[PDB]
Amino acid sequence: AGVKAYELRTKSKEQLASQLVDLKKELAELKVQKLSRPSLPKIKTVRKSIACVLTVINEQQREAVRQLYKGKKYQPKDLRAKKTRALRRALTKFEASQVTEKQRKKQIAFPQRKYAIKA
Amino acid sequence: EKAGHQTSAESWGTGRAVARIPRVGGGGTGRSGQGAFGNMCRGGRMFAPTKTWRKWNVKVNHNEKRYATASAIAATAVASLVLARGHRVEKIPEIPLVVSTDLESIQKTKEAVAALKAVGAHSDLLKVLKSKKLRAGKGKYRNRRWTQRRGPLVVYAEDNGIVKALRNVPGVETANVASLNLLQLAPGAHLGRFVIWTEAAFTKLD
Amino acid sequence: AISKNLPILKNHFRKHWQERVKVHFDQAGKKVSRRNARATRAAKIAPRPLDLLRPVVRAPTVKYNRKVRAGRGFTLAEVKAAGLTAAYARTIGIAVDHRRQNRNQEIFDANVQRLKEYQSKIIVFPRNGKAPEAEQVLSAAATFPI
Amino acid sequence: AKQSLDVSSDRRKARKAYFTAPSSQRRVLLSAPLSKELRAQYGIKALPIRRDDEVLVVRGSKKGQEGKISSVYRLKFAVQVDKVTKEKVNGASVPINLHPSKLVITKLHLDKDRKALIQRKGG
RNA sequence: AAACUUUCAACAACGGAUCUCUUGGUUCUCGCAUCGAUGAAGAACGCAGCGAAAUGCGAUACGUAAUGUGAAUUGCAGAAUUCCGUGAAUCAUCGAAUCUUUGAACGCACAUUGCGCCCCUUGGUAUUCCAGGGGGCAUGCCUGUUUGAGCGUCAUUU
RNA sequence: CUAUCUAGCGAAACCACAGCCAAGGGAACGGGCUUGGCAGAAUCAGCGGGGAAAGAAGACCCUGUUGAGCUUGACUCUAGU
RNA sequence: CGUGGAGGUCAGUGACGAAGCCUAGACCGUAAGGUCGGGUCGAACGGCCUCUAGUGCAGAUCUUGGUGGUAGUAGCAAAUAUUCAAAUGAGAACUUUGAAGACUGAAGUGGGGAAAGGUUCCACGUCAACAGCAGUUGGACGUGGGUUAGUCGAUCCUAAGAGAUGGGGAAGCUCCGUUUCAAAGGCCUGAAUGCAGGCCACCAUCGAAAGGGAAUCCGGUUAAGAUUCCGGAACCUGG
RNA sequence: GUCGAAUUUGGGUAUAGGGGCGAAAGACUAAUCGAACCAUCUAGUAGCUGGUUCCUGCCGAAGUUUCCCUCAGGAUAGCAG
RNA sequence: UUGACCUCAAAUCAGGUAGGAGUACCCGCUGAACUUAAGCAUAUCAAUAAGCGGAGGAAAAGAAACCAACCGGGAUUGCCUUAGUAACGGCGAGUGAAGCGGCAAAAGCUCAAAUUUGAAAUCUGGUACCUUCGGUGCCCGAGUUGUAAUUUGGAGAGGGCAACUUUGGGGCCGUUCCUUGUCUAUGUUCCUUGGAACAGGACGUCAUAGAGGGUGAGAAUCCCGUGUGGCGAGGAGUGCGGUUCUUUGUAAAGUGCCUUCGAAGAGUCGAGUUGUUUGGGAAUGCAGCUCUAAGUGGGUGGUAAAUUCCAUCUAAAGCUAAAUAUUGGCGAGAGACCGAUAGCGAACAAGUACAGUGAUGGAAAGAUGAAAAGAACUUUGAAAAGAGAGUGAAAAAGUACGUGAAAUUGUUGAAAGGGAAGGGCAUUUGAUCAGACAUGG
Numbered sequence A: 001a002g003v004k005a006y007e008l009r010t011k012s013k014e015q016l017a018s019q020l021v022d023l024k025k026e027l028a029e030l031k032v033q034k035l036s037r038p039s040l041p042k043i044k045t046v047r048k049s050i051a052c053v054l055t056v057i058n059e060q061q062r063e064a065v066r067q068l069y070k071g072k073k074y075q076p077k078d079l080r081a082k083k084t085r086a087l088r089r090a091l092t093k094f095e096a097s098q099v100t101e102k103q104r105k106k107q108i109a110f111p112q113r114k115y116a117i118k119a
Numbered sequence B: 001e002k003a004g005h006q007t008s009a010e011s012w013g014t015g016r017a018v019a020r021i022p023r024v025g026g027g028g029t030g031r032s033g034q035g036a037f038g039n040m041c042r043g044g045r046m047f048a049p050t051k052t053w054r055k056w057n058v059k060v061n062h063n064e065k066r067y068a069t070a071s072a073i074a075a076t077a078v079a080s081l082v083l084a085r086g087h088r089v090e091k092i093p094e095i096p097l098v099v100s101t102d103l104e105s106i107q108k109t110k111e112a113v114a115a116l117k118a119v120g121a122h123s124d125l126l127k128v129l130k131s132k133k134l135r136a137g138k139g140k141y142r143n144r145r146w147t148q149r150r151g152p153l154v155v156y157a158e159d160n161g162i163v164k165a166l167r168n169v170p171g172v173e174t175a176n177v178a179s180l181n182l183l184q185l186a187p188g189a190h191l192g193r194f195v196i197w198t199e200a201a202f203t204k205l206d
Numbered sequence C: 001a002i003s004k005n006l007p008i009l010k011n012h013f014r015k016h017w018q019e020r021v022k023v024h025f026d027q028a029g030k031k032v033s034r035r036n037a038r039a040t041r042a043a044k045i046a047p048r049p050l051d052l053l054r055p056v057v058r059a060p061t062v063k064y065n066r067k068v069r070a071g072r073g074f075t076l077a078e079v080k081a082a083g084l085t086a087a088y089a090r091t092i093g094i095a096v097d098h099r100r101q102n103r104n105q106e107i108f109d110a111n112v113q114r115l116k117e118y119q120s121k122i123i124v125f126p127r128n129g130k131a132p133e134a135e136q137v138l139s140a141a142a143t144f145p146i
Numbered sequence D: 001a002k003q004s005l006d007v008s009s010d011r012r013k014a015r016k017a018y019f020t021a022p023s024s025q026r027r028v029l030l031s032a033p034l035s036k037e038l039r040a041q042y043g044i045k046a047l048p049i050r051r052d053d054e055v056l057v058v059r060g061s062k063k064g065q066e067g068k069i070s071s072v073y074r075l076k077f078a079v080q081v082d083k084v085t086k087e088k089v090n091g092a093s094v095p096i097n098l099h100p101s102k103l104v105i106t107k108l109h110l111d112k113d114r115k116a117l118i119q120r121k122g123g
Numbered sequence E: 001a002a003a004c005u006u007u008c009a010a011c012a013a014c015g016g017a018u019c020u021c022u023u024g025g026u027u028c029u030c031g032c033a034u035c036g037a038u039g040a041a042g043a044a045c046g047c048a049g050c051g052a053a054a055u056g057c058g059a060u061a062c063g064u065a066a067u068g069u070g071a072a073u074u075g076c077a078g079a080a081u082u083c084c085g086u087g088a089a090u091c092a093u094c095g096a097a098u099c100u101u102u103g104a105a106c107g108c109a110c111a112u113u114g115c116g117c118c119c120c121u122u123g124g125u126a127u128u129c130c131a132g133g134g135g136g137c138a139u140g141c142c143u144g145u146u147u148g149a150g151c152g153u154c155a156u157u158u
Numbered sequence F: 001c002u003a004u005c006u007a008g009c010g011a012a013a014c015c016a017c018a019g020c021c022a023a024g025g026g027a028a029c030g031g032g033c034u035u036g037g038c039a040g041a042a043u044c045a046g047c048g049g050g051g052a053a054a055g056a057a058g059a060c061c062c063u064g065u066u067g068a069g070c071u072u073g074a075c076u077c078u079a080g081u
Numbered sequence G: 001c002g003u004g005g006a007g008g009u010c011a012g013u014g015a016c017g018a019a020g021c022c023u024a025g026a027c028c029g030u031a032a033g034g035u036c037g038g039g040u041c042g043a044a045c046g047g048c049c050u051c052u053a054g055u056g057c058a059g060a061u062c063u064u065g066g067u068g069g070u071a072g073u074a075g076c077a078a079a080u081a082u083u084c085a086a087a088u089g090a091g092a093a094c095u096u097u098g099a100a101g102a103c104u105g106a107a108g109u110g111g112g113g114a115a116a117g118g119u120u121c122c123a124c125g126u127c128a129a130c131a132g133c134a135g136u137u138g139g140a141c142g143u144g145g146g147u148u149a150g151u152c153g154a155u156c157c158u159a160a161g162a163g164a165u166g167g168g169g170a171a172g173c174u175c176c177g178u179u180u181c182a183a184a185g186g187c188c189u190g191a192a193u194g195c196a197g198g199c200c201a202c203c204a205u206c207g208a209a210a211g212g213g214a215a216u217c218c219g220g221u222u223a224a225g226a227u228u229c230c231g232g233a234a235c236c237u238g239g
Numbered sequence H: 001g002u003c004g005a006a007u008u009u010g011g012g013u014a015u016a017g018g019g020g021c022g023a024a025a026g027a028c029u030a031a032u033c034g035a036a037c038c039a040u041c042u043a044g045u046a047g048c049u050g051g052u053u054c055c056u057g058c059c060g061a062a063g064u065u066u067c068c069c070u071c072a073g074g075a076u077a078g079c080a081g
Numbered sequence I: 001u002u003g004a005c006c007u008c009a010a011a012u013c014a015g016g017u018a019g020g021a022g023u024a025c026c027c028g029c030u031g032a033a034c035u036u037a038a039g040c041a042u043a044u045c046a047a048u049a050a051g052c053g054g055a056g057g058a059a060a061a062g063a064a065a066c067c068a069a070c071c072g073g074g075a076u077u078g079c080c081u082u083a084g085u086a087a088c089g090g091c092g093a094g095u096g097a098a099g100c101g102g103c104a105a106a107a108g109c110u111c112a113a114a115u116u117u118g119a120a121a122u123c124u125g126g127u128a129c130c131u132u133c134g135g136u137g138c139c140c141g142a143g144u145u146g147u148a149a150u151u152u153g154g155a156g157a158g159g160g161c162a163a164c165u166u167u168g169g170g171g172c173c174g175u176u177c178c179u180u181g182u183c184u185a186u187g188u189u190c191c192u193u194g195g196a197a198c199a200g201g202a203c204g205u206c207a208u209a210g211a212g213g214g215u216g217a218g219a220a221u222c223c224c225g226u227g228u229g230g231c232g233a234g235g236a237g238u239g240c241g242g243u244u245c246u247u248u249g250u251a252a253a254g255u256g257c258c259u260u261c262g263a264a265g266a267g268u269c270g271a272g273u274u275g276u277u278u279g280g281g282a283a284u285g286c287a288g289c290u291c292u293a294a295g296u297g298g299g300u301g302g303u304a305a306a307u308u309c310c311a312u313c314u315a316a317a318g319c320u321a322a323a324u325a326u327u328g329g330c331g332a333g334a335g336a337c338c339g340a341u342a343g344c345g346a347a348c349a350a351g352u353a354c355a356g357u358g359a360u361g362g363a364a365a366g367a368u369g370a371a372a373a374g375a376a377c378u379u380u381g382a383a384a385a386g387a388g389a390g391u392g393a394a395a396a397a398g399u400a401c402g403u404g405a406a407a408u409u410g411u412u413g414a415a416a417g418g419g420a421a422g423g424g425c426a427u428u429u430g431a432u433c434a435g436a437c438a439u440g441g
């Protein structure tokens, strides 16, 4: 039951804030009835919903902070490439590309010649 | 290598009224005190443990290799051998069976099958259909569950699709006359493979 | 110990030899994969024949000096005597060896001959991609034997 | 035989694969053949069996019996139909596990992507 | 003659040989090249309607998002079974997050759930004192920056 | 208080096979072999003659081109000096 | 002669019963062994020709596992001691209660704590195992309950001692060193916060539940907690 | 035996294996000390004990020679297949 | 008084980086003994184990201060062979490489020392601005104690001269590659046994599919697959062919000829000595201390020295693919392997339960049946259970569960028995088995 990922993404922050609070109100009230009854399997879907609400609220604020940093040279390490320690310190495609002026002319003067031999 | 040798076990020495074999340290578990290393003791190391560098492949002289493949062919001419080797060539017009080279182009099974049956290979075909049986040993779970006889050897010059046509038939195998494997020629080192030749193949032999 | 009448052997196996032991079980797969490694080179390399032209060289000492052998590269004298520069002679696939000077004419002749005669049977494609369809010969040395 | 360097014929991994197959993959191993009628109409031999399919037992001591699929028990590699039940001597009735391959589907419960599957298969 | 003892048989015990099983081991080959201060490896404690393990996870806790898939999961219960459907599932996939207390482990400690300092914000009169919330302060080194020291030292003094 | 008898509970040592002698010869001190004495179910409490009784691959002794603790103008070295 | 596996072959055997096992039953072989019947059994297995080995057991104070005689035997005898009745229970020398007889005799068989254990505490259920007789009982089994602090501890301080830091060794893991051959700071004031005041400056930290130390008592209360809860009366530090 | 001091003792702390510690016994250093405990080198070497797995058929020994830091072992010739 | 400079500090200065894990392979350091020598010290084990520092997907080595002595050869690595050879060795035990030759793979290279000196032409950052692995403009910083171009010995530079040759940067379809989805054959006919047909018989079918697994027993055709082809979706990215641009070029490269010039690495090479190592022997490498070069110089040329020549390379600075390594990691395919005392220790809640203060030590243990149909109900019992009765193909499968051996044990039956028992030959007695019976009714 409970909440749905796409429906939440439309609602505004300040509504989500209140969404949560009455889910916490419910889940709290659940745990009361829970110990007065022969179990209560129902409480699973609301505590999962709280995760979803909180996932979305996170999605927004992260994306929002993603915008505020767009195009800039220095972005929070939270939001960076990840990939690999070893990887992300490898030379950039630019840095590996550089070639000494002596060579760039040698790489022009006599670059590899495609040929063949018939008969 | 590590087998049966992963442990600290020392001997206990004489004087404990216990055999001198190495025995396991510590306590608190049945393993402690038990016999270690050694072939006689459970959980130990096997005597003279098998090595990979055991000599597996065997070298043969090339001329002697061809001498084997040669007689192996000549036996396919002898009616009594091929008969004795367990092949159903009982009737059939003549040995050798040489067949129309059009065979080499047959690309579909139902054709290639009835092609052989009509040239007189039907009886040693049906054989291999009736010889499939569960394997005798534990090789059953070693990826050989089944054991069957040998159908005829269909030998060509060029492969125009006879190979794909007979690749699914139970017991027939196909070979170029340029190669001619002795294993196929004398299965079990048994002379007299029943061999169906194509005229193109047969005229190539010399 | 020492018994009967037998030649004295020397078997160097006191050393933990069973540690460093190489079987080659891979001789099959190290060939099958040695082929596929060459097969797709020539694929990626397109009409070019997998190897440089290699010179004719005398080979040394008092034992193998009788025969003649493929050397490393064509050296310097023969490259200009073939009418082209070093730096270009490597672009058309040819072996250039800057050491090994020429102390022998009969070889120097045959080698420069081996160059022009190579330059003959080739076809060297232009800057562009418009070229005469290029059937690929894989061998070079066996196309220009010695 | 297998011509591919991908498929293996090794008996061990095969039985590992069957028994460790997940629920998604089991659903396909739980395919059932289609009845002479349903074969005609849809031009399709077999489809993964699913719940509410009416069915006909083609094998076993229940052969020639009919009912609707009560549940597909994928955990079990088995299937339950109503009307086919053991009555234990305590008076209770108990569902009898049957195999999809020993069943034939006499009516398909269809929805959109069950339709679109019958179409997605050529035939 | 019994009892007793011994030997044999039958049935019954004791025990798990043997036979047949094999989601395991073992060895050969083939292909690929990716751990970590963006917090790894490893550890601790937790997390399910009913779990002690194994397994999975991290207070969003046997999982949240995304994608596919097309109806189950199943020990009982429960459901919304929300089935021509943005949709079942202990499914596959995984590109988005969460990720307690730790650990090279970074304010200082650490047989302690011990103890400082800085910044923002909320409540208690509140610049100060107490409390809640949020973010912070390791080392060596490089490049840069800002601020300094030295009759090491060149000019200017006026 | 034990032992002893009973209800209940219930081990261990050891074990080639076993268990009456005399002599004989015998690896020169036999439960077994040879010749004699003999020889009758099933058993309980005691006992310390035998079982060359049990305990532990003799420590004494010798052997081993097997050690170790130790000593010294043995052989060969060495920190320090 | 026999065993595991391998190529070949009998189109060999078999759910109408393979293999195994049991047979004071049969036959063959000098023998290793082979063959058959009967029983029990449940899914595989054999003959011949070859190949190949982790291929044949009575011992090794062999290894592991199982089992005997010993044997219903040695034993269940230290710590003065038990008895009558009831209740409960299928069942009582052993449980509960009553009574009688006794003991430890406060340097205790009393009343608390430290280390250590870790729920053993308490209550209800409950006796297969465990309590070397017994068990209706238990420190067992099952299910639950339970440990409340400004003042009692920890926390703070320093002890023997340990240990970073400039540094100096060492190939290095690392060693030395604790004020040393170091530019080692952090207070109170005014002008909401920087400059102007200004003193002062050998020195991380860890190290005591028995050392040092801020400060609580009585009465009541639970099945099980109390200098902690409640009622009343106080005190100490910090605002 | 000693029992008001070279007394008994808790806890904290220090010294570690050719090392410690010793009012000295080769004592003690976790039931381990004339060199701890743990793993590895290690399946250490053994001229020395012990064991060494089916049947039948034929042939059939030696304890002597010489050399050996050789005397419980080898080489060597002899006997044997 | 004010402004720089050198050097040296500080900051919770702005941006970063190192640590740890892993360790099969890889580069180094350090470093044994057991052992062999039938003793033992050199030697051997071994330039090994243990200990330490540093990497990658490979590492390393590499464009020769090489090998040779030939008609010479020509970076490196690996295979084959040199070769159990040369040599080392109480010349004992033992040790032991190299040059050539065949093959695998092949790939070459750049700095330092030169005045741009008619122009620091070089570069880090900050910053706005965009087309963001970056691009421009501006600005602080670096730097003349040397940033750029140019040159690397195979050269090559300056001049002098004389003609011919040659180009750049973007992306827009398709291919290849990685992720990844999906389509693509043929009996469930008859009979018989059985609980179950997957069995045997009958009649068929498909096969570029008769690998394998699943399903109530030996299943090509019941299911998943297998074989052959076909169609999507998302990714890299410059290789392969195809697009059309831009105009790189008031740049760059190639090549001819004359004459002059041609910088080439020091507490290094080399040496002495010490130690160690090596097959390296009057000294193979390595390092300590001491000495310390030259520039037609220097190193090597495997017997030390003087002398005379000859041969061949250019140290003391640097980068690089492939062939090569791989008891680790990830993903696969296999075997004349092992079959629960085997095979890894672990087929299982196995590095677990348990032991130790600690480092460490470290097990046992798979199988009811097709399916729980897991024995309703009656009955004796305090109860655990027993007895009926049910399920099942079977209970001679009942969660002590497939088959159920031996030791050992209970009952029943048979026989024997005066201080063991068992064995050989023979026979009485009993029990028990047999082979031999068809020729006229």
Ligand SMILES: NC[C@@H]1O[C@H](O[C@H]2[C@@H](O)[C@H](O[C@@H]3[C@@H](O)[C@H](N)C[C@H](N)[C@H]3O[C@H]3O[C@H](CO)[C@@H](O)[C@H](O)[C@H]3N)O[C@@H]2CO)[C@H](N)[C@@H](O)[C@@H]1O
Residues within 6 Å of the ligand: B017, B018, G064, G065
């Ligand atoms: N087959 C029994 C063997 O017992 C061995 O283990 C046993 C031994 O280690 C040890 O047995 C000792 C024995 O070593 C020593 N030499 C004599 C001693 N009397 C024995 O004792 C053992 O056996 C006796 C006799 O049955 C029993 O009465 C006794 O209870 C038992 N502990 O006690 C263990 C348990 O009996 C091994 N597990 C294995 O070799 C094998 O299982």
Ligand SMILES: NC[C@@H]1O[C@H](O[C@H]2[C@@H](O)[C@H](O[C@@H]3[C@@H](O)[C@H](N)C[C@H](N)[C@H]3O[C@H]3O[C@H](CO)[C@@H](O)[C@H](O)[C@H]3N)O[C@@H]2CO)[C@H](N)[C@@H](O)[C@@H]1O
Residues within 6 Å of the ligand: B129, B130, B131, B132, B133, I204, I210, I220
């Ligand atoms: N004689 C009629 C023909 O038999 C042919 O084939 C015969 C067999 O080969 C086939 O039976 C199967 C077969 O389907 C499959 N592809 C192979 C399998 N081994 C065969 O199995 C057969 O042989 C085994 C022994 O091997 C025997 O037990 C039994 O006869 C049978 N099960 O079925 C037939 C029975 O003998 C075809 N079915 C067809 O051409 C036609 O029916």
Ligand SMILES: NC[C@@H]1O[C@H](O[C@H]2[C@@H](O)[C@H](O[C@@H]3[C@@H](O)[C@H](N)C[C@H](N)[C@H]3O[C@H]3O[C@H](CO)[C@@H](O)[C@H](O)[C@H]3N)O[C@@H]2CO)[C@H](N)[C@@H](O)[C@@H]1O
Residues within 6 Å of the ligand: E106, E107, E136
């Ligand atoms: N100061 C160093 C920096 O710390 C940063 O990390 C900051 C936080 O993310 C980190 O927070 C830690 C957290 O890691 C951890 N899992 C939970 C913990 N409570 C937090 O701890 C922080 O606050 C506590 C308060 O009691 C302090 O005791 C602790 O020293 C401090 N690190 O503590 C830092 C702030 O004190 C970054 N990891 C990095 O840039 C760098 O290492």
Ligand SMILES: NC[C@@H]1O[C@H](O[C@H]2[C@@H](O)[C@H](O[C@@H]3[C@@H](O)[C@H](N)C[C@H](N)[C@H]3O[C@H]3O[C@H](CO)[C@@H](O)[C@H](O)[C@H]3N)O[C@@H]2CO)[C@H](N)[C@@H](O)[C@@H]1O
Residues within 6 Å of the ligand: I150
């Ligand atoms: N010494 C006479 C000859 O000089 C020649 O000198 C070379 C160069 O100096 C000469 O000059 C080339 C010129 O060819 C070409 N077409 C134009 C190019 N800019 C020049 O290039 C040269 O000169 C520039 C200055 O202009 C310098 O930076 C530098 O020396 C070089 N790049 O081109 C020659 C190419 O090899 C060669 N070294 C050789 O032929 C011979 O020695």
Ligand SMILES: NC[C@@H]1O[C@H](O[C@H]2[C@@H](O)[C@H](O[C@@H]3[C@@H](O)[C@H](N)C[C@H](N)[C@H]3O[C@H]3O[C@H](CO)[C@@H](O)[C@H](O)[C@H]3N)O[C@@H]2CO)[C@H](N)[C@@H](O)[C@@H]1O
Residues within 6 Å of the ligand: I375, I387, I388, I398
């Ligand atoms: N007695 C009535 C009920 O029996 C039930 O139990 C039934 C079974 O589980 C139990 O089975 C027992 C078994 O437990 C035990 N291990 C022994 C035996 N294998 C079985 O025995 C049973 O089956 C046999 C065979 O037909 C009958 O002869 C016998 O009477 C019967 N008790 O026997 C019972 C049937 O008589 C439950 N225990 C309970 O509901 C109640 O006691």
Ligand SMILES: [Mg+2]
Residues within 6 Å of the ligand: B003, B004, B043, B044, B045
């Ligand atoms: Mg083992």
Ligand SMILES: [Mg+2]
Residues within 6 Å of the ligand: B017, G061
């Ligand atoms: Mg003994």
Ligand SMILES: [Mg+2]
Residues within 6 Å of the ligand: B108, B109, B110, B111, I207
């Ligand atoms: Mg066909």
Ligand SMILES: [Mg+2]
Residues within 6 Å of the ligand: B135, B136, B137, B138, B139, B140
């Ligand atoms: Mg087998």
Ligand SMILES: [Mg+2]
Residues within 6 Å of the ligand: B136, B137, B138
């Ligand atoms: Mg078998």
Ligand SMILES: [Mg+2]
Residues within 6 Å of the ligand: B141, B142, D012, E022
């Ligand atoms: Mg297997």
Ligand SMILES: [Mg+2]
Residues within 6 Å of the ligand: B140, B141, B142, B143, B144, B145, D010, D011
């Ligand atoms: Mg198999």
Ligand SMILES: [Mg+2]
Residues within 6 Å of the ligand: C050, C051
């Ligand atoms: Mg090549």
Ligand SMILES: [Mg+2]
Residues within 6 Å of the ligand: D006, D007, D008
């Ligand atoms: Mg697959």
Ligand SMILES: [Mg+2]
Residues within 6 Å of the ligand: none
């Ligand atoms: Mg395998």
Ligand SMILES: [Mg+2]
Residues within 6 Å of the ligand: D090, D091, D092
């Ligand atoms: Mg009922």
